[PDB]
Design an enzyme around this catalytic site. Sequence first.
Site, mmCIF file in Angstrom:
data_model
loop_
_atom_site.group_PDB
_atom_site.id
_atom_site.type_symbol
_atom_site.label_atom_id
_atom_site.label_comp_id
_atom_site.label_asym_id
_atom_site.label_seq_id
_atom_site.Cartn_x
_atom_site.Cartn_y
_atom_site.Cartn_z
ATOM 1 C CG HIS B 49 -1.555 0.990 1.605
ATOM 2 N ND1 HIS B 49 -1.726 2.468 1.971
ATOM 3 C CD2 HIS B 49 -2.908 1.479 0.635
ATOM 4 C CE1 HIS B 49 -3.296 3.054 2.093
ATOM 5 N NE2 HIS B 49 -3.841 2.889 1.363
ATOM 6 C CD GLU B 52 -2.929 2.567 -4.134
ATOM 7 O OE1 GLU B 52 -3.083 1.371 -3.603
ATOM 8 O OE2 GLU B 52 -3.772 3.033 -4.620
ATOM 9 C CG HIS B 53 0.625 6.266 -0.554
ATOM 10 N ND1 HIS B 53 -0.116 7.573 -0.170
ATOM 11 C CD2 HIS B 53 -0.406 4.805 -0.261
ATOM 12 C CE1 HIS B 53 -1.432 6.556 0.600
ATOM 13 N NE2 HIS B 53 -1.365 5.223 0.646
ATOM 14 C CD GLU B 122 2.888 10.190 0.486
ATOM 15 O OE1 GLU B 122 1.426 9.731 0.301
ATOM 16 O OE2 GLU B 122 3.088 11.137 0.118
ATOM 17 C CD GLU B 129 -4.423 6.349 2.969
ATOM 18 O OE1 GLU B 129 -3.022 6.187 3.201
ATOM 19 O OE2 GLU B 129 -4.781 6.547 2.261
#
Lengths: 53, 438
Positions: B49, B52-53, B122, B129
């Site tokens: 994940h 993906e960022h 990030e 998140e």
Amino acid sequence: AFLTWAAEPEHDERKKLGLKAIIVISAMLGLSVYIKKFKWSPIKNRKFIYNPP
Amino acid sequence: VSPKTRTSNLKNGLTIASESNPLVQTATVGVWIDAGSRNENAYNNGTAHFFEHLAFKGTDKRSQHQLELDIENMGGHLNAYTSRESTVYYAKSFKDDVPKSVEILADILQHSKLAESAIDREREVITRELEEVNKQYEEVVFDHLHATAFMNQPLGRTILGPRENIQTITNTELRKFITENYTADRMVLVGAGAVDHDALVELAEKYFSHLPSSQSPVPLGTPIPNFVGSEVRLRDDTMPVAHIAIAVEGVSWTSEDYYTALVAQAIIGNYDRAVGTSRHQGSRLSNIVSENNLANSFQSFSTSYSDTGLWGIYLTSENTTQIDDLVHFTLKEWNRLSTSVSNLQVERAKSQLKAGLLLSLDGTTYVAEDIGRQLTTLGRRVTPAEVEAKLEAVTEHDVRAWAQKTLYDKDIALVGLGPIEGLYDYNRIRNDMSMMRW
């Protein structure tokens, strides 16, 4: 001995029926312990995480 | 009758699959990868994940800003998502902007910078998140559902990963992950809409030819999960709506019972008080729920993975004193899949599904998602004729036999969120998985 029999003539039958009852009731008691523990285990095993709001 | 899905391979083992539609003017091209969170261990959980960022944070050529501009200039958009077993990166564009989009996707997958500065930036975004998924109740419920059903197993892990890992993920482990997993034999380049297959194969030969092959190439959609009957309760008296999911272990993509489980799911079906037609649906559970105001909605699901699945229902309700009735009636409808269903319900569900499986594919993105999913789970796109035959093969005997081995008297995974005081303990819920009268 004869007078004892005269007072309680059911004596011999009573004690044999008692033996049967003891055996059955003991087995039922043992199984009822297993079944209670089986059914209660989700409550006994429950765990919590608390995050104060 | 839809156009044929064309399929080609490259030398490295990259599959190219396309379905052209000369009636549309847009095209969705992208890369479906047979890899996702499940491929992480406990220490690097969250990596897929995280990547993906970073995929959109700049490559060896284009910087973050140049990347943004290049896509803006194309006119369409790029999108990505990581699941437990699948990662997707696609680009929707105009017909003649397809070579640009393939080039950008090839760049962000093969040649991403993963610069320490961007990792660090990030690392905060992803940390935020963690505290905002909390609002998406359906996702909270399904993530707890996987966590408990597959307790301490890879399928049980979340996609975001723990807070601890987010703080310790390095560019090294990111690079290691994508080198081990993003291999050509695990990847499918898919095009749907206004694409020429032969053009797409050429673009694949131009951009994806220097992809690593894995040492031991297994077939696409190749995987042992041990389901745990269990419950998570997240009681919150301040929420007005209860969200409840109940599931049993379901079927994998390649199970022989795959269609039987879909038919069974369609017999219960979905319901939503907000939709006008829902009060008139044929499903017995729908009728019970709507007549008695037991729920705002329910949604039956049959989620598949490579080697397991979850089959169950997701319920939402404001009726906090009759949650017991809602759960009771739901599980008694499941009992009937074992005891009572006949050709009446089975043929009705088959009718509904024969259309449903075709109706779902109503745009290029849906078509691409269908080609990509099927290629990465089954190794081939299954034609609608084959699908119609597999559905037709489902009998009422098949449904009863399946429900008797999968549902009847089986353990459930149960998640409750919200005002769930009225949801009874595990035993009373699980006791509704059978009927004493039968």
